[PDB]
Design a protein around this ligand. Structure first.
Ligand SMILES: [Zn+2]
Length: 7
């Protein structure tokens, strides 16, 4: 799957 991190 795809992964996104929004700090
Ligand atoms: Zn993946």
């Amino acid at each position: 799957g795809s992964n996104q991190n929004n700090f």
